[PDB]
Amino acid sequence: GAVVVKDLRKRIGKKEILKGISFEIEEGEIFGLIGPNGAGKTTTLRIISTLIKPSSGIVTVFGKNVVEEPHEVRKLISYLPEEAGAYRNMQGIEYLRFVAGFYASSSSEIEEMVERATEIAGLGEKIKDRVSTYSKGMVRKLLIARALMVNPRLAILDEPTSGLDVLNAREVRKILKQASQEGLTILVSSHNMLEVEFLCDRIALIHNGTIVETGTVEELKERYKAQNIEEVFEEVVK
């Protein structure tokens, strides 16, 4: 329903990066496109977000073809690229005001966005500190807050927990899970196969630009008699 990818191909330079992949994401869930570095996850997530176009195949977001109706699609999505940063010479709350202003000019809408963001970030009084003082995990919470504050129907997050220590990765997972429990559909990319069971409801395993399996995390574990997703992946691709 929420996202349907059908025989998606994408050439970049000499390479067929995506090799005719298919999968579907259900409304209201956290879906993981999971695989090692170089598998094509970023390209996939970027095509779904309308930033780049397919070479062929069809992608629909909530029933809207992303190539035929991109306008309608973009009204529904928010994309956060991997390792996004924020402007360091602003307070957190100031950064959030600034960016909220891209989306709207009305004080009311800006205020609403900023207050949603502050509440998602969970930075306490530190939101009034300069971003240059923030740890990596704080920047990441600020950025995800910023992606989520526009109340998208679908959030597309490229490696949301990469680079994070144990505590911050857990807080980020918490944020995403709460957001999905409030109705948000989230497409994440990740190469951390142990942690995927504690974040995603369903996954597509991707290898060299091919989907080698899909299902709920539990289905896959039961299907391959595997206690974790890295074992599934390994079982499936050699």
Next chain:
Amino acid sequence: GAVVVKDLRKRIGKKEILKGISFEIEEGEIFGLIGPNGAGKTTTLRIISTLIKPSSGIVTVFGKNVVEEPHEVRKLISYLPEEAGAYRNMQGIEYLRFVAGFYASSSSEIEEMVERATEIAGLGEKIKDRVSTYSKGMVRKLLIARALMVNPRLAILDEPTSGLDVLNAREVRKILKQASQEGLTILVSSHNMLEVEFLCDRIALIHNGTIVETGTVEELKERYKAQNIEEVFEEVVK
């Protein structure tokens, strides 16, 4: 059209042999399901022939669901398992009469089958010799003749050229190509990736029970800048 496989899974014992595979075969072509030993090709070909049932997914042969209408499907197909043999203590022509008798009792139908078979086999006067005197390649031509003599709409051949020397493999390829040029749809399985360009119009590359690519042989070569299918396969799965 001719065969459509959709999310086909099949468990055997502890193993998910087929891992939700999809592909389609066009009427009148030779299609190759291509991959190494153990990839799941025989199981696939057997499910399509109605001999074993899916665990899940859907297979249709000329629009007939093989699970809902197996009767209608079997009227359309002929399956030849890998390394099939013939009864050695009969003349070739005698073996062909005997087997034709399984399919029909009428002299006319038996005669027609036997004459089609003799013409496909191309064994000349050797068809009157005992099968015990036949070379491997002669047995193989006799068996393929036997599969094809019933005029199926779809022939499903499991590794039709395996074990064969250069000459006999070439004659078998000739037989299949001629038969397809006369309207027959042929599904073959093979692990000989160099020879697939000289037999198949389209292929699905299969690895560990997953389809990792599909297309015409030329499309795949052009897509992966590869001069042969073994290079494509290698490029695609690691």
